[PDB]
Design a protein around this motif. Structure first.
Motif, mmCIF file in Angstrom:
data_model
loop_
_atom_site.group_PDB
_atom_site.id
_atom_site.type_symbol
_atom_site.label_atom_id
_atom_site.label_comp_id
_atom_site.label_asym_id
_atom_site.label_seq_id
_atom_site.Cartn_x
_atom_site.Cartn_y
_atom_site.Cartn_z
ATOM 1 N N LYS A 1 -9.997 2.040 6.377
ATOM 2 C CA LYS A 1 -9.852 0.838 7.185
ATOM 3 C C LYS A 1 -8.683 -0.012 6.707
ATOM 4 O O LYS A 1 -8.517 -1.141 7.176
ATOM 5 N N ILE A 2 -7.874 0.495 5.785
ATOM 6 C CA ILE A 2 -6.805 -0.287 5.181
ATOM 7 C C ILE A 2 -5.509 0.036 5.904
ATOM 8 O O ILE A 2 -4.917 1.101 5.693
ATOM 9 N N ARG A 3 -5.059 -0.882 6.754
ATOM 10 C CA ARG A 3 -3.817 -0.710 7.487
ATOM 11 C C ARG A 3 -2.592 -1.229 6.758
ATOM 12 O O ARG A 3 -1.499 -0.703 6.988
ATOM 13 N N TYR A 4 -2.741 -2.216 5.883
ATOM 14 C CA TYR A 4 -1.646 -2.765 5.095
ATOM 15 C C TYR A 4 -2.251 -3.491 3.901
ATOM 16 O O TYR A 4 -3.452 -3.389 3.641
ATOM 17 N N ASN A 5 -1.422 -4.225 3.172
ATOM 18 C CA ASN A 5 -1.885 -5.031 2.047
ATOM 19 C C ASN A 5 -2.022 -6.459 2.552
ATOM 20 O O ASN A 5 -1.028 -7.139 2.803
ATOM 21 N N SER A 6 -3.262 -6.913 2.706
ATOM 22 C CA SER A 6 -3.487 -8.227 3.284
ATOM 23 C C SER A 6 -3.318 -9.346 2.272
ATOM 24 O O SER A 6 -3.126 -10.497 2.669
ATOM 25 N N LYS A 7 -3.391 -9.046 0.978
ATOM 26 C CA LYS A 7 -3.298 -10.077 -0.043
ATOM 27 C C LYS A 7 -1.903 -10.194 -0.631
ATOM 28 O O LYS A 7 -1.754 -10.577 -1.796
ATOM 29 N N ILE B 1 0.846 -1.200 0.000
ATOM 30 C CA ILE B 1 0.000 0.000 0.000
ATOM 31 C C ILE B 1 0.878 1.246 0.000
ATOM 32 O O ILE B 1 1.914 1.269 0.686
ATOM 33 N N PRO B 2 0.559 2.269 -0.793
ATOM 34 C CA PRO B 2 1.251 3.554 -0.649
ATOM 35 C C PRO B 2 0.819 4.256 0.630
ATOM 36 O O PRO B 2 -0.362 4.267 0.979
#
Ligand SMILES: [Mg+2]
Ligand SMILES: [Mg+2]
Ligand SMILES: [Mg+2]
Ligand SMILES: [Mg+2]
Ligand SMILES: [Mg+2]
Ligand SMILES: [Mg+2]
Ligand SMILES: [Mg+2]
Ligand SMILES: [Mg+2]
Ligand SMILES: [Mg+2]
Ligand SMILES: [Mg+2]
Ligand SMILES: [Mg+2]
Ligand SMILES: [Mg+2]
Ligand SMILES: [Mg+2]
Ligand SMILES: [Mg+2]
Ligand SMILES: [Mg+2]
Ligand SMILES: [Mg+2]
Ligand SMILES: [Mg+2]
Ligand SMILES: [Mg+2]
Ligand SMILES: [Mg+2]
Ligand SMILES: [Mg+2]
Ligand SMILES: [Mg+2]
Ligand SMILES: [Mg+2]
Ligand SMILES: [Mg+2]
Ligand SMILES: [Mg+2]
Ligand SMILES: [Zn+2]
Lengths: 118, 86, 158, 122, 50, 203, 53
Positions: free
Chosen positions: E33-39, E22-23
């Motif tokens: 709600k996006i804290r990191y890249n989960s995929k 994620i940038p």
RNA sequence: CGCGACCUCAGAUCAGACGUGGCGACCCGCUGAAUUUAAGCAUAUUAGUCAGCGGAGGAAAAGAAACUAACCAGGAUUCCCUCAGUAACGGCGAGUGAACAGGGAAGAGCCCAGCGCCGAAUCCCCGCCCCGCGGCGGGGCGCGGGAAAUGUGGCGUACGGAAG
């Protein structure tokens, strides 16, 4: 008239070509892959500029439907320079890095600093 | 040599990604998909798996034409007319 | 395993009955649907009788019910030819016809013929062209008095 | 300035094509500036030039196809992209003439026996 | 496999471009709600299919 | 009129004139292929009373249904269940061979619509039926009001919903006391109306 | 020549009409009118032809 | 030998159309089990059910009696209440099981083939003119082509019908 061969084959009949009363598509489709939208941007990496200062070539990123003849004709129309040869590859990103080796009368460094990359 | 050492020879693959359903189920020797039944003209579809139906029906993907035909149905498929200008 | 005393019962639930159960929670919604459609029909055929055409005196078939006279399908062709109504003009002026009915009797036919003559006395037929009245058209003073009747046209009471 | 689709429509075709390839040159040199590392002004201007090309091409396509269906407005066989694109069953529907055709039987029946206008005295 | 086909190579190109994080300017957004890249996908752990 | 003579002539079938004609026609129809188009109907009077009017857009196919009952399509013997359902050899198919004929004619001609069909001959191993088809997008059909009912989407593939004459003969419907197990729309509609609880609101 | 199936069919149908015991009701159309009587009748029938459109 | 009609049957990137596939809650046609119940089990039951296959529509199907009845008789189809867990079926065991009449929702009827009589009186397609044209239609003109007598149209369909 007599029949020599004892096998009967289908006699050749006349067949006409199309004379349609209306075209299927009304307008011919515009070439969405033209000389501007075929090349996207030249690479400005250190390997790219070392190659333009050494091998008198240029390095571009083009889309994957481009032929070497299409890239040659595109660079000739867009920059008015003659092209010796073209070497293409598809990067692991999915782009097509092309290598446009120029004719020896042109110099890639002055071509580059007139087209903007320096 | 039924288990661990027999799992070492797993190196040539059976299926590949199909070119109609996008799943890796296009068998290579039979050359038929196990998920959509590709060379057959009809989609593989069975009522003994409601979940396998639900995973790709009309609603799943883009509905790229069908949401357009929904909002053209809500005005009765007008054509050739434009709203009058300024 | 039956208990001490009671009926022995055979309930027909041995099939899969829960998958086929009709439940009536749209009963009042469907009553309102029939009612709104009936009112829209009644104002659509606007001075004509709301109950539709006229249906003859008819008594019921069997031994249990032949003492009772009810409404039938339509006026028979012999009834119409005695009443002088053409069999194709009866459905235009609002008289139900069926060709299937026989007549084995006389006074039932005479009751139906009297009913047709009474109906043709009672009906107000508007002109087919409003500006130009014609021969069999009623007069313009009772044209202004013509209105619908609710309930069946001349109800058949026993 | 800020190009818009009002004043492009009286503009004739070769004027639109030279304005198009001028915008194409401008977008290509903005991409070169993006790769070499330019200013936020250039990187903002990229979207403006892309939508400039987009509405010039929209005006060109609309003014071509309006003339196309003017050319095919009188004729009996007109192309499939010019025919009405309603739904498939709605095109395979019988038209309002063939659904209104009545045979002579029912023409003379609805002549002789019209449904009259009646009411019943209660 | 250095004898890839073009379809498989373009598929791997898309998965390689998707495996980036994620940038950092995103988690300054309002309803985030996006804290990191989960995929994300490491090449030892998940073998991607194919 | 000649059609009265033609239909009484076809009523006399075991008489030598029609028996000669039927065995010669049956020979020829066996020599031809399975689904071939006849250019005009073999039985004009029967075609006319079934619906064929010899105008542009009605075609006749002459199709061959292989004759016999229906054995159960299972491996060797091997119906895996109770001794009631070991039926394999002497089973019979629920629809007539005429209906099978018109349904495979209508499947082979998907752009066309089955009107009716009739009988043109039989052998020990085949029966031959001529199926009438209508081109529903030909304007001689489409501009005639009393045959443009076939051009509506409700009449799409009548042969496979079982809506032609030989399809209706196997649905077991008709007025009467003989047909109590089909009242409703059909036999399944009868079963469905009977085997539901009408659980009311107030019971 | 190995003829096509329709040529073979329309020839050996004629062979079967020569083979089979044809009933008199179908034989009677082979007993046909001869040449000079037929051309006389068609010369007479040319006088009474119906009209073209 | 050739030429010309017709009949059967091919080949066309011929002119114009049409079908294919998807969803599938509801609908139609076919196929079709076994668990289960019988305190075992084989007929039955589960059950014309699940699974399978084909085909649609906005509803489908059905539908204007080769009907119900046995009465002083009703009168297309569909649906509801009832008939009725009745008549009936069933190792007459377990279990299964409709219809008529009656009351309501609704309500609408019709068309061919045949028998015939009218000079094929019928229909499709191309060219031109006028109008309308985002449901290709209306009119006129063609010694323009074709279908059709192996039967198109008008009248006419069991309630009778036609002609004078
Ligand atoms: Mg293998
Ligand atoms: Mg399927
Ligand atoms: Mg106890
Ligand atoms: Mg009522
Ligand atoms: Mg008629
Ligand atoms: Mg590993
Ligand atoms: Mg059993
Ligand atoms: Mg029978
Ligand atoms: Mg073509
Ligand atoms: Mg389909
Ligand atoms: Mg048991
Ligand atoms: Mg037990
Ligand atoms: Mg046991
Ligand atoms: Mg059963
Ligand atoms: Mg099923
Ligand atoms: Mg639909
Ligand atoms: Mg229907
Ligand atoms: Mg029907
Ligand atoms: Mg009833
Ligand atoms: Mg009781
Ligand atoms: Mg049962
Ligand atoms: Mg009843
Ligand atoms: Mg006639
Ligand atoms: Mg009748
Ligand atoms: Zn697949």
């Amino acid at each position: 008239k007599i029949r020599t061969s004892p096998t009967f084959r289908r006699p050749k009949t006349l067949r006409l070509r199309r004379q349609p009363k209306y075209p299927r598509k009304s307008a011919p489709r515009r070439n969405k892959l033209d000389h501007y939208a075929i090349i996207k941007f030249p690479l400005t990496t250190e390997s790219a500029m070392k190659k333009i200062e050494d091998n008198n070539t240029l390095v571009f990123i083009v889309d994957v439907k481009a032929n070497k003849h299409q890239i040659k004709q595109a660079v000739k129309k867009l920059y008015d320079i003659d092209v010796a040869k073209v070497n293409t590859l598809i990067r692991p990103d999915g782009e097509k890095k092309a290598y446009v080796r120029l004719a020896p009368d042109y110099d890639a460094l002055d071509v580059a600093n007139k087209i903007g990359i320096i | 040599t039924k288990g661990t050492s027999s799992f070492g020879k797993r190196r040539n693959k059976t299926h590949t990604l199909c070119r109609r359903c996008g799943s890796k189920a296009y068998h290579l020797q039979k050359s038929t998909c196990g998920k959509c039944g590709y060379p057959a003209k009809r989609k593989r579809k069975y009522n003994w798996s409601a979940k396998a139906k639900r995973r790709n029906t009309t609603g799943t993907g883009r509905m790229r034409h069908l949401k357009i035909v929904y909002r053209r149905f809500r005005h009765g498929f007008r054509e050739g007319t434009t709203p009058k200008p300024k | 395993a039956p208990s001490r005393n009671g009926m022995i019962l055979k309930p027909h639930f041995h099939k899969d009955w829960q998958r086929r159960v009709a439940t009536w929670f749209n009963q009042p919604a469907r009553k309102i649907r029939r009612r709104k459609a009936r009112q829209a029909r009644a104002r659509r055929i606007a001075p004509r009788p709301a109950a539709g055409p006229i249906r003859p005196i008819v008594r019921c078939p069997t031994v249990r019910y032949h003492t009772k006279v009810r409404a039938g399908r339509g006026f028979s062709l012999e009834e119409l030819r005695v009443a002088g109504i053409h069999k194709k003009v009866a459905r235009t002026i609002g008289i139900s016809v069926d060709p299937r009915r026989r007549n084995k009797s006389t006074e039932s036919l005479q009751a139906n013929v009297q009913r047709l003559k009474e109906y043709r006395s009672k009906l107000v037929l508007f002109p087919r062209k409003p500006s130009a009245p014609k021969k069999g058209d009623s007069s313009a003073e009772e044209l202004k008095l013509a209105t619908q009747l609710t309930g069946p046209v001349m109800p058949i009471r026993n | 300035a800020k190009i818009k689709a009002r004043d492009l429509r009286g503009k004739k075709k070769e004027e639109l094509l030279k304005q198009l390839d001028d915008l194409k040159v401008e977008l290509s040199q903005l991409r070169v500036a993006k790769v070499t590392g330019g200013a936020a002004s250039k990187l903002s201007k990229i979207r403006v030039v892309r939508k400039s090309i987009a509405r010039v091409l929209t005006v060109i396509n609309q003014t071509q196809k309006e003339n196309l269906r003017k050319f095919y407005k009188g004729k009996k066989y007109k192309p499939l992209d010019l025919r009405p694109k309603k739904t498939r069953a709605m095109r395979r529907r019988l038209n309002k003439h063939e659904e209104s055709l009545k045979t002579k039987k029912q023409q003379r029946k609805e002549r002789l026996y019209p449904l009259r206008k009646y009411a019943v005295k209660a | 496999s250095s004898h890839k086909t073009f379809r498989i190579k373009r598929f791997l190109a898309k998965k390689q471009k998707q495996n980036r994080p994620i940038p950092q300017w995103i988690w300054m957004k309002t309803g985030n709600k996006i804290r990191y890249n989960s995929k994300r996908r490491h090449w030892r752990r998940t073998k991607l299919g194919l | 009129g000649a059609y009265k003579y033609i239909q009484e002539l076809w009523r006399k079938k075991q008489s030598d004139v029609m028996r000669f004609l039927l065995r010669v026609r049956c020979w020829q129809y066996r020599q031809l292929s399975a689904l071939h188009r006849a250019p005009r109907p073999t039985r004009p009077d029967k075609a006319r009373r079934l619906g064929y009017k010899a105008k542009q857009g009605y075609v006749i196919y002459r199709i061959r249904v292989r004759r016999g009952g229906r054995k159960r399509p299972v491996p060797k013997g091997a119906t895996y269940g109770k001794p009631v359902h070991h039926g394999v050899n002497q089973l019979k198919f629920a629809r007539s061979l005429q209906s099978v004929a018109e349904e495979r004619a209508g499947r082979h001609c998907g752009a066309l619509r089955v009107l009716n069909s009739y009988w043109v001959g039989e052998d020990s191993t085949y029966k031959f039926f001529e199926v009438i088809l209508i081109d529903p997008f030909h304007k001689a059909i489409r501009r005639n009001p009393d045959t443009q009912w076939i051009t509506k989407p409700v009449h799409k593939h009548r042969e496979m919903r079982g809506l032609t004459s030989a399809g209706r003969k196997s649905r077991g419907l008709g007025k009467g006391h003989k047909f109590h197990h089909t009242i409703g729309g059909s036999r399944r509609a009868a079963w469905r109306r009977r085997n539901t609880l009408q659980l009311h609101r107030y019971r | 020549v190995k003829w096509p199936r329709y040529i073979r069919l329309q020839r050996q149908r004629a062979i079967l009409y020569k083979r089979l015991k044809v009933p008199p009701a179908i034989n009677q159309f082979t007993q046909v009118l001869d040449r000079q009587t037929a051309t006389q009748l068609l010369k007479l029938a040319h006088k009474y032809r119906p009209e073209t459109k």
